Design a protein around this ligand. Sequence first.
Ligand SMILES: O=C(NO)N[C@@H](Cc1ccccc1)C(=O)O
Ligand SMILES: [Zn+2]
Length: 307
Amino acid sequence: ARSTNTFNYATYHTLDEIYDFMDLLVAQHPELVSKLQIGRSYEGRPIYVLKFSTGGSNRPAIWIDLGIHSREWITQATGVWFAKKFTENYGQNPSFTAILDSMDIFLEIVTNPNGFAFTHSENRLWRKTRSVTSSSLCVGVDANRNWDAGFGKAGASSSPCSETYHGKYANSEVEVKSIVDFVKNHGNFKAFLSIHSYSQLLLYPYGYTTQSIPDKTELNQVAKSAVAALKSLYGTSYKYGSIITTIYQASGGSIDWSYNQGIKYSFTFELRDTGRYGFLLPASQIIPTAQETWLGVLTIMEHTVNN
Ligand SMILES: O=C(NO)N[C@@H](Cc1ccccc1)C(=O)O
Ligand SMILES: [Zn+2]
């Protein structure tokens, strides 16, 4: 309510509640976290990113986004928990402290604010953005089919009414371009993590082509380690591998774009579960999901620091 220590992390929140949370966190830890507005949504809502930094100019950074697909509520809920955990473990956990003393972490909890608000007021299963385009009565674009990586190719739909519609052209969605511009301007990101649900998978590039990435051997081992770490908590089983070999051919995905930009440690997490609840995961699983996911994320971060 009026203190991140009183905030209920075991329940799902609205857009306003999450945004308020950000202000409270920043007010409580001014020396560690700051709120940056990287753009505005199609409908004009501000797009915020939380920057966790210990100092420095343009220290190598880790990017983490959640909620690019509005209906995957477990992701924004995990992002809120992550934000609080960062402030609790710095100075207490030797590994994480080491990470923050040398790198910055950028966390975008609500990557698709228009769609998120829509899931709360009209359609709980909305997945796309909220932009409208003349030649169609259908609304929205699949933000994770809109990136400049094999755009328009197999793995995305060309019909505006489709849940996987890629849009008119790469980066047409302001929600996507806002991230692209910020990452490009920064120029020093070392890791790029995009979180989704559901399926319990840890994926690496590529999704748009069957071509194997040059760093396949290293990324596969990093994923193997992260999955083992995540499983150690509650025994949750995750599969891992390239997007195209694990799920299916998908074009215009964020991770493929970031990897092609030279950001080697690009991974997408697909959280719980494997279909029993799907997108409607019970609130009682928020904390356990967040706790185990953190172990997998920390593993990737550790590798990035020492590499
Ligand atoms: O959103 C979900 N839910 O399972 N899955 C992702 C799969 C994915 C991941 C990374 C790159 C391309 C495609 C999706 O965007 O459809
Ligand atoms: Zn998704």
